[PDB]
Design an enzyme around this catalytic site. Structure first.
Site, short mmCIF file in Angstrom:
data_model
loop_
_atom_site.label_atom_id
_atom_site.label_comp_id
_atom_site.label_asym_id
_atom_site.label_seq_id
_atom_site.Cartn_x
_atom_site.Cartn_y
_atom_site.Cartn_z
N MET B 86 0.87 -1.16 0.00
CA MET B 86 0.00 0.00 0.00
C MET B 86 0.91 1.21 0.00
SD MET B 86 -3.08 -1.22 0.05
CE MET B 86 -4.30 -0.15 0.81
N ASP B 130 -7.09 -6.00 16.61
CA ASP B 130 -6.08 -4.94 16.68
C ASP B 130 -6.40 -3.82 15.68
OD1 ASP B 130 -3.91 -4.11 18.25
OD2 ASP B 130 -2.37 -4.92 16.89
N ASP B 157 -1.42 -16.79 19.53
CA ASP B 157 -0.84 -17.33 20.75
C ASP B 157 0.66 -17.10 20.81
OD1 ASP B 157 -3.47 -18.10 21.15
OD2 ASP B 157 -3.05 -20.26 21.09
#
Ligand SMILES: Nc1ncnc2c1ncn2[C@@H]1O[C@H](COP(=O)(O)OP(=O)(O)O)[C@@H](O)[C@H]1O
Ligand SMILES: Nc1ncnc2c1ncn2[C@@H]1O[C@H](COP(=O)(O)OP(=O)(O)O)[C@@H](O)[C@H]1O
Ligand SMILES: NC(=O)c1c(Nc2ccc(I)cc2F)cc(F)cc1OCC[C@@H](O)CO
Ligand SMILES: NC(=O)c1c(Nc2ccc(I)cc2F)cc(F)cc1OCC[C@@H](O)CO
Ligand SMILES: [Mg+2]
Ligand SMILES: [Mg+2]
Lengths: 291, 291
Positions: B86, B130, B157
């Site tokens: 991007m 997030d 995790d």
């Protein structure tokens, strides 16, 4: 002689925290094996010379309880601090394979730390700022040494974010504001000792059923505990009364009430540990297999 | 075709968070420029195939509001996720040079995010986990896309530690325990919008004198604020009443009372933003200078 980037050769990776990776390296011109910490910092060139410049006092940080310093330089987006390679690793690593560290041994550890912190205070006017098992390093000659202390004001700032790992060694006053100083290192030390003594990070403390076996928690939950709930303590019975009081004096919430280096130095536990005939070198290998 | 380590060539570094660095790279065999995220994880080989395997669903993550996925592999201690580059960077970067992002623009942003989160929910049964300005990415074609969502259980995790940076976008329920889910993304989105609208991370909120200029905080202090003090809000006057309510519905403390994607989709602010004739592409360059 001056340390330069292309004079080094990578041997292996000693581990990573966040902010830095540390490698085991050969300094080709000397033959010396050293440990090279690399900090990736996206920062202007003016300040990055101030960092290098502020890291040079480490050349005068000579104590048997402080990791040795070889040099510091900037190359390719990263600050390099080159240290004495401690072949025993950090106490967080030796804890993992030890399972638990004996009282006897933590005696010798406590002495190194207090003496290290004292050296930094008296000779250099600095607090550590990050006492935890992985900033306490050991080796095959039986030495126990601190590193990663805050020598450089500007480095401290440029790295400013810290530790969210489901586990924190910051004192209550440090977690709640700017009103903290050297007493805060004592809290961290006390908590590290209880961890190493017990085998696990000691918050929340072991509930009655969990202390039987002796032959997670969310961010706010954990922090609220530290600041608002009564401090961790050694279980009774399996550790000496003198050790228990010693950690108890370290983990008092109010930093002015907490014991300071002057007092811990002359504490019954330290006096009892200093006399003791302990082959740390021998124990260290017996547990991690270096020979 | 399969992506392999030695088929790539480094062009520049796009930045670093903790855990990962991301580079701008050329995939030599295709000529494609892509962004390669590298996560240094010291983990056994069994689980690291499960990560790669769990990252493969990203091949089916096709939405104009989700960053494109090219492939994932393991090489030299690090997982590589290769994405669409991007060229506009993240909204945290465009915020820095913009100073402040107009209401009009945040209208178009809000739509992308809601639609992105909705895509992930309906088509893939995942929450983001997030949402913050640096996981919202833009480009010169005017696209606004999410990445860094939690596709891989095992990755989540193995990376488990998180965000201590003097700034947190976690919802109160997420900060206080495990009793949270998708509603939590709405909180994060709401807080990101107030930040971008205002020019600074919005806690503590601007005191009366500080909102005049319109032409730090410790860890526990900040968290206690989030969970125990009334939520942030847009200042009155300089933002529309519809935007104000919109963020207000996002930043309600109780996650069951908070608006959900279904409701925000049909909110007056979104309906008003969707109709508006905004040249985002044009604004994006006018501010960051891409042409
Ligand atoms: N001088 C050294 N000698 C040997 N090992 C070291 C040395 N410095 C650091 N290490 C190892 O590197 C690891 C990571 O160091 P660091 O980047 O400071 O992260 P952390 O201390 O947060 O784990 C330490 O846990 C330790 O095992
Ligand atoms: N696909 C991408 N295209 C362009 N830039 C990217 C891409 N992914 C990440 N970046 C840039 O890399 C930076 C760091 O990414 P990351 O490792 O996820 O850290 P963080 O998101 O915490 O800043 C981002 O802030 C962004 O500027
Ligand atoms: N973390 C470091 O490695 C560090 C540091 N490193 C350091 C110091 C002495 C020796 I012998 C070897 C070292 F590598 C020197 C500083 F001046 C500040 C630092 O870190 C500052 C952040 C911490 O305060 C909290 O994370
Ligand atoms: N952080 C990531 O980059 C990440 C991740 N990366 C990721 C996902 C999609 C795309 I298109 C590009 C990407 F790079 C995929 C996961 F499955 C879990 C992750 O991170 C998990 C930790 C977070 O939940 C909190 O920090
Ligand atoms: Mg360290
Ligand atoms: Mg990101």
């Amino acid at each position: 002689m001056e340390l330069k980037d292309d004079d080094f050769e990578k041997i292996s990776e000693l581990g990573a925290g966040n902010g830095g990776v540390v490698f085991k390296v050969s300094h080709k011109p000397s033959g010396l094996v050293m440990a090279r910490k690399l900090i990736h910092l996206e920062i202007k060139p003016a300040i990055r010379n101030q960092i290098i410049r502020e890291l040079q006092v480490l050349h005068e940080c000579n104590s048997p309880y402080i990791v040795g310093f070889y040099g510091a330089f900037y190359s390719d987006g990263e600050i390099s601090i080159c240290m004495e390679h401690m072949d025993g690793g950090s106490l967080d690593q030796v804890l993992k394979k030890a399972g638990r560290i004996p009282e006897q041994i933590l005696g010798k550890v406590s002495i190194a730390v207090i003496k290290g912190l004292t050296y930094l205070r008296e000779k250099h006017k600095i607090m550590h700022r990050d006492v935890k098992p992985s900033n306490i390093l050991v080796n095959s000659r039986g030495e126990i040494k601190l590193c990663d202390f805050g020598v450089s004001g500007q480095l401290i700032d440029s790295m400013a974010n810290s530790f969210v790992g489901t586990r924190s060694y910051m004192s209550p006053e440090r977690l709640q504001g700017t009103h903290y100083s050297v007493q805060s290192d004592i809290w961290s030390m006390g908590l590290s000792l209880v961890e190493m003594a017990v085998g696990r990070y000691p918050i929340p403390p072991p509930d009655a059923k969990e202390l039987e076996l002796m032959f997670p928690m969310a961010i706010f939950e954990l922090l609220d505990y530290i600041v608002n709930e009564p401090p961790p303590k050694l279980p009774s019975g399996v550790f000496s009364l003198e050790f228990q009081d010693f950690v108890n004096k370290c983990l008092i919430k109010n930093p002015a009430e907490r014991a300071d280096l002057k007092q811990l130095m002359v504490h019954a536990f330290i006096k009892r540990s200093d006399a003791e005939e302990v082959d740390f070198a021998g124990w260290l290998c017996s547990t991690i297999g270096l020979n």
